[PDB]
Amino acid sequence: SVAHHEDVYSHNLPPMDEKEMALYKLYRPERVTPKKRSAELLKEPRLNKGMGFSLYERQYLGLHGLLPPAFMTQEQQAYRVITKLREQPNDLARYIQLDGLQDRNEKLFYRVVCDHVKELMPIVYTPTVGLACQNFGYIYRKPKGLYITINDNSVSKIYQILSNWHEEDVRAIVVTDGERILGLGDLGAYGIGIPVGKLALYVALGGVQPKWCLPVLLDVGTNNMDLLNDPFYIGLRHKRVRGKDYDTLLDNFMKACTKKYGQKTLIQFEDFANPNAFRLLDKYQDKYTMFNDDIQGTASVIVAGLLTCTRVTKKLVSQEKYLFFGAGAASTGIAEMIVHQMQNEGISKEEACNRIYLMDIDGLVTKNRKEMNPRHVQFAKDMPETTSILEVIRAARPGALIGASTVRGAFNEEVIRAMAEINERPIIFALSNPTSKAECTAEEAYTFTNGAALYASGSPFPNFELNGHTYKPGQGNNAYIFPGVALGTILFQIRHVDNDLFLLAAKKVASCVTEDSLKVGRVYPQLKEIREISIQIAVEMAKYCYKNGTANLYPQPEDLEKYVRAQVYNTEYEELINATYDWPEQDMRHGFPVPVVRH
C-alpha cells in the first residue's frame, strides 16, 4: 500500500510542475474495480486478460485453477494471436477468429488489431465483414448488438430493448437496416456484422471507448429473395416495409435512443439504400447528433486527397476543375463538398459548380436534360451532349478525373494520356471497389503518365516502380475521417455535425501527409497514423466548436490536447484490484480512542 503522504497509482511519473501535476490529476483515467469474480469475470471481454492474469491476480479474484498454469505478457499473447491468424486458410476464417477474440479479451483484440492495422483492417471490416454476413449466415457469438424490428415500433418498445443492453453509458451508436451492405446488397438481419465492425474501428482507429459503443440493426424485412427462401434465414420473413411505418420506426428509434442515453448520443447510419440514406440524413442532421458515413465520410475522404494534391498541382481547390465519371451517391456527395470548400475559399456558388463536370450512365450531365436528380441540376452544364470521356476531357480540360462508376477500366490508356497532356501532373482517382471494378489501376495510371499522375484508389493496389522511381499509391479509405469525427463529436458533445466539420477533418488529414509520403505519390497518410490523426481532428473540432458555441461539454477544458489524450482508449492491461493507501498511523488504529472500564 501507498504511504500516507503519497497518492494512489502515482508512481514513477515524469517530472511535473505543481500546476502541471494538478491538470494531470484532473484529466487522468481513474481505476475501476469490477464486481465479478471467477468464471463470471473470465467471461467478461472487458475484464478478461486470459493467461495475462498474474498468479496473485488469479488467487485474489478467484480465477486460480480456471486458466492453464502458464503466465503471459500481452505482447506474447498478441504474438500467439498473430501467428494463428496467419495460419488460417482464408480471410473469412481470420474474421471468425478475430470476432471470437473481441468476445474473449477486448484489450488483446484492439492490441492486435492496432498493431497490424494495415494487415487486419480489411479483415475486421472493409471487405471481409460483408462477405462473412453473406456466406456464414447466422454467426455464433456473444450478444454484441441489438435487433430492433418493425414489430417493436414505439418509443417504449425500443426503450425496453435498449434497456436490455448491459452498458448504461452508451455515447455512440452505429445503425443499419442492412438494405445496402457495401458491395453485396440487401442482406437483411444478416447485416448485424456491419455495425459491429464499424464500431470496432471507432475504437481501434479513433480511440473511442469501447463501453460507449452499441451496434444496432433495424429489421423491417428483406427484398433479397434468396433469404426469404432460405430455411436458415433468421430475420423477419417478408419484403421490406416502406410506408409511414418505416418513417415512424426511425422516428421512434431516434427518440428512444436519445431518451435513454441522452440527446448528445452520436447516431451514425451505415449501409442504408442510397435514396433512404440521403433522405434520412436530411431529416435528422439538424435535429440529432447524427451523420451518414457512406455519404459525408466519402465526401470528406476524397476532398482530403484532392486537398493534399493541391500541394503539387499548385492550384487551389477553387482554382481547379473536376470531372467526375459517375454521378451517383459518392460522386454527387464529393462534388457538393468540393463546392462548399470552394466557397470557403473566397468564391461564390456560381463559379464553384461551374468548375465541376459530372458524367452518368447517360453521358455528360447537360441542361437540356429530362427527369434528372435535383442535386445534379446545379452542376449540369450548358454544353453539347456526349458519352465520350475523352471528348469531355478535351472540352473542359479538367484538372482532376475522379472515378466513381461501376465500370472497370473505364479510364483507358487514351483517357489517361489526355489527362497528362492537358496537365503537368494530372489527378486520377479510381474509387470503384473492389480493385476488379477500378476505372484503372495504379500501374496503368503511372505508366501511361510516365509517372507524373497523382493516383488514389478505393481498394489497395501494389506499389509500382517506373523508370527507377518508386510509387506507393494510396486509398481513399473512409477510416481516415469518421474515427476522428466520432471522437471529437463525443468528447466535446457537439450538438450537430455539419459539412464544415467534415471539411475541417479533411484539411486535417491532408495536413498530416508527410513530405516523404508525398515524394512517393501518396496523397493519404499511413493507416497506422489514424489514431494520432483522430486525436488531432478531435482537438481541431473543439477549437472550432467552442468558437461558434456548438460544443456542449462545459466548460472548455484548459488544455484540449491533454484532455483528449487522457480520454482515448488504452490497449494496455489495467489493474483490477483496488489501490490501497495509508492514513496517519494514529487515525488507522483499531480500538477505543479513550479508555473505558470493561463491563
Ligand X SMILES: NC(=O)c1ccc[n+]([C@@H]2O[C@H](COP(=O)([O-])OP(=O)(O)OC[C@H]3O[C@@H](n4cnc5c(N)ncnc54)[C@H](O)[C@@H]3O)[C@@H](O)[C@H]2O)c1
Q: Does residue 211 interact with its own copies by CB under 8 A?
A: no
**DSSP code for 322:** E
Judged by DSSP in three states, 519 sits in: coil
289 contacts 369 by C-beta, under 8 angstroms: no
Query: Within 13 Å, how many C-alpha atoms sit on residue 378's CB side?
Result: 13
Q: Pick between residue 359 and residue 560 the one whose CB is nearest to ligand X.
A: 359
Task: Determine if 64 is a binding residue for its own copies (CB under 8 A).
Answer: yes
Measured distance CA(258)–CA(264) in Å, rounded? 7
Q: Which of 107, 144, 198, 260 is catalytic?
A: 198
- The interface region with its own copies, picked from 433-441, 479-487, 511-519, 550-558 by CB under 8 A, is 550-558
Tell whether residue 154 is a contact of its own copies (CB under 8 A): yes
**For ligand X, the closer CB: 283 or 375:** 375
- As to burial, measured by CB atoms within 10 angstroms (0-12 exposed, 13-18 middle, 19+ buried), residue 425 is middle
In the complex with ligand X, the residue whose CB is nearer, 257 or 304, is 304
For residue 598, what are the CA distances in angstroms to 239, 491, 589, 595? Answer: 83, 60, 19, 9
Question: What is the DSSP annotation of 13-35?
Answer: -----HHHHHHHHHHSPPP---S
Candidate list 255, 375, 381, 408; residue touching its own copies; CB under 8 A? 255
Record the cell numbers describing residue 78, joined without a space.
498478441
Q: Which does 82 bind (CB under 5 to 8 A by kind): ligand X, its own copies, none?
A: its own copies
Q: Which is nearer to ligand X, 137 or 183 (CB)?
A: 183
Closest distance of CB 376 from ligand X, Å: 9
Q: Which of these ranges, 147-155, 205-213, 265-273, 428-436, lies near its own copies under the rule CB under 8 A?
A: 147-155
Is 113 within 8 Å of 200 (Cβ atoms)? Answer: yes
Closest residue to bound ligand X by CB: 328
**Choosing among ligand X, its own copies, none, which partner's interface includes residue 404 (Cβ < 5 to 8 Å by kind)?**
ligand X
Distant-in-sequence, close-in-space partners of 151: CB < 8 Å, separation ≥ 6 = 236
How far apart CA 402 and CA 324 sit, in angstroms, is: 5
Asked if 72 interacts with its own copies (CB under 8 A), we say yes
Distance of CA 68 to the CA centre of its chain: 37
Residue 569 is among the residues annotated as catalytic for this protein: no
Closest CA to 506 of 540, 472, 529: 540
Residues 6 or more apart whose CB falls under 8 angstroms from that of 160 comprise none
Q: Output 108 or 129, the one with its CB closest to ligand X.
A: 129
Specify whether 198 is catalytic: yes
CB of 554 to its own copies, least distance (A): 6
Tell me, residue by residue from 567 to 596, as one string, x for binding to its own copies by CB under 8 A and - for no binding. Answer: ----------xxxxxxxx--xxxxxxxxxx
Question: Which segment (62-70, 330-338, 343-351, 512-520) binds its own copies by CB under 8 A?
Answer: 62-70
Q: Is 418 annotated as a binding residue?
A: no
| Cell numbers that stand for 123 in this block | 479483415
- Binds its own copies (CB under 8 A): choice among 46, 88, 93, 100: 100
Partner whose footprint covers residue 326, from its own copies, ligand X, none (CB < 5 to 8 Å by kind): ligand X
**How does DSSP classify residue 476?**
-
CB of 256 to its own copies, least distance (A): 9
330 marked among binding-site residues: yes
Which positions from 284 through 343 interact with its own copies, judged by CB under 8 A? none
Nearer to its own copies, 155 or 452 (CB): 155
Q: Is 552 one of the annotated binding-site residues?
A: no
Nearest distance, CB of residue 181 and ligand X, angstroms: 12
Residues in binding contact with its own copies, number by CB under 8 A: 112
Distance separating alpha carbons of residues 321 and 85, to the nearest angstrom: 46
243 binds its own copies (CB under 8 A): no
Burial class (CB in 10 A: 0-12, 13-18, 19+), 151: exposed
Site for its own copies in 440-499 (CB under 8 A): 495
Q: Which residues pair with 356 in a beta bridge?
A: 322
From the list its own copies, ligand X, none, which binds 33 (C-beta under 5 to 8 Å, kind-based)?
Answer: its own copies
Is 180 annotated as ligand-binding? Answer: yes
Alpha helices in 103-221 (DSSP H): 106-115, 117-124, 128-136, 155-163, 193-201
Give catalytic residue positions: 125, 198
Annotated binding site for fumarate: 77, 80, 104
Binding site for NAD(+), by residue number, is 180, 274, 294, 327, 330, 433
